[PDB]
Amino acid sequence: EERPYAYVKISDGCGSLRSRSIEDITREVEDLLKEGKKEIILVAQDTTSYGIDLYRKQALPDLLRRLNSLNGEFWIRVMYLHPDHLTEEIISAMLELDKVVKYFDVPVQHGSDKILKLMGRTKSSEELKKMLSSIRERFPDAVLRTSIIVGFPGETEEDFEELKQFVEEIQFDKLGAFVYSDKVDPEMAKRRQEELLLLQAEISNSRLDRFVGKKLKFLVEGKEGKFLVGRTWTEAPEVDGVVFVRGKGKIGDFLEVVIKEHDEYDMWGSVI
């Protein structure tokens, strides 16, 4: 197709966890770069679990290093990270490798230790926060993307309160809020959902502000009249926002753009 990006399934297990070899995934990506792809998106149920069944260890670091060394200017984006398995080896590799975009897709589900334990999550809110802050400390512009579930059976005003300061302390760039489904009523669950989103809107906008008037790499994906449509490294395809830039360019090309304004998580800028 004419899309400048491609999804690469590094494993399809969880069914039994089955990882493809580093060499097989590498050859697939090489072929993709040969056909002009500029963004490689690594996917799986849990990308941080890659290699466990084949190399007897989390080989995501090794995989990224191999892909990073492939020839050319392109992006490597990882998605579906599981916080309980996001090791320092992975974080460091992602922050170290120049072609890996500092985009961290890690849904934490909640911020209350009580609810987290009830959901089966291992790491505690304090640990999650230390991990996330650690990333931001090494790379201030790091995009942190997560998903939250409000309305979980047993969620009390106290739990939701802990969640709010949790999201306030981390300052995620992107965060989705969903309501539980199959001990808590849906009435207050709605207020909590809109409150979480209401609070996050502030945070998401604040994060986007520090990008205004700044130079970012832009991947062209389409052309609509006098506008170029595409994404800056901070945006995954389809699930995030879009960037509108006025200027000349062809699909699949990397351009330098300066964001002038944003709205509803979408951005508007110009080619520089």
Curated annotation (Swiss-Prot):
Residues 1-207 form the Radical SAM core domain. One of its GO terms (biological process) is tRNA modification. GO terms for cellular component: cytosol. [4Fe-4S] cluster 2 binds at residue 14. Transmembrane segments: none annotated. It is found in: Cytoplasm. Its EC number is 2.8.4.4. Residues 209-272 form the TRAM domain. It comes from the Bacteria. Keywords: 4Fe-4S, Cytoplasm, Iron, Iron-sulfur, Metal-binding, S-adenosyl-L-methionine, Transferase. It is an enzyme of class 2 (transferase). Binds 2 [4Fe-4S] clusters. One cluster is coordinated with 3 cysteines and an exchangeable S-adenosyl-L-methionine. The two iron atoms in each cluster are connected via a penta-sulfide bridge. One of its GO terms (molecular function) is aspartic acid methylthiotransferase activity. It catalyses: L-aspartate(89)-[ribosomal protein uS12]-hydrogen + (sulfur carrier)-SH + AH2 + 2 S-adenosyl-L-methionine = 3-methylsulfanyl-L-aspartate(89)-[ribosomal protein uS12]-hydrogen + (sulfur carrier)-H + 5'-deoxyadenosine + L-methionine + A + S-adenosyl-L-homocysteine + 2 H(+). Monomer. This is Ribosomal protein uS12 methylthiotransferase RimO. It comes from Thermotoga maritima (strain ATCC 43589 / DSM 3109 / JCM 10099 / NBRC 100826 / MSB8). The gene is rimO. The chain holds residues 135 to 430 of 430 of the full protein.
